[PDB]
């Protein structure tokens, strides 16, 4: 869990809508099942895909204010970001098989 990227909604201007590169941004709580169940498969694709993608978090109960800027109406709901633009969504939990087809059809 060492490469994640921790945001807050201060930072996530900074860390995400001002960047260049590709960042995978898992908005989460505590509370949520589905968003623990993918937590690993989340470390797994941050050493993965290093390099050529970075991972992130915004949990929701302690950043309240970002997620409604993009519609979020669940979680977990991944956000892929390139060059400061969603460039993908997706709602719910899914294997990582899934998310490395999901990210391979943004390649
Ligand atoms: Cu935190």
Same mark, same amino acid.
């Given at each position: 869990?060492?490469?994640?990227?921790?945001?807050?909604?201060?930072?996530?201007?900074?860390?995400?809508?001002?960047?260049?590169?590709?960042?995978?941004?898992?908005?989460?709580? %505590?509370?949520?099942?589905?968003?623990?169940?993918?937590?690993?498969?989340?470390? %797994?694709?941050?050493? %993965?895909?290093?390099?050529?993608?970075?991972?992130?978090?915004?949990?929701?109960?302690?950043?309240?204010?970002?997620?409604?800027?993009?519609?979020?109406?669940?979680?977990?709901?991944?956000?892929?970001?390139?060059?400061?633009?969603?460039?993908?969504?997706?709602?719910?939990?899914?294997?990582?098989?899934?998310?490395? %087809?999901?990210?391979?059809?943004?390649?």
């Amino acid at each position: 869990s060492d490469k994640i990227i921790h945001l807050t909604d201060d930072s996530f201007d900074t860390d995400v809508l001002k960047a260049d590169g590709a960042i995978l941004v898992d908005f989460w709580a %505590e509370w949520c099942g589905p968003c623990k169940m993918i937590a690993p498969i989340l470390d %797994e694709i941050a050493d %993965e895909y290093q390099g050529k993608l970075t991972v992130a978090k915004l949990n929701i109960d302690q950043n309240p204010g970002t997620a409604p800027k993009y519609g979020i109406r669940g979680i977990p709901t991944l956000l892929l970001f390139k060059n400061g633009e969603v460039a993908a969504t997706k709602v719910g939990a899914l294997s990582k098989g899934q998310l490395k %087809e999901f990210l391979d059809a943004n390649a």
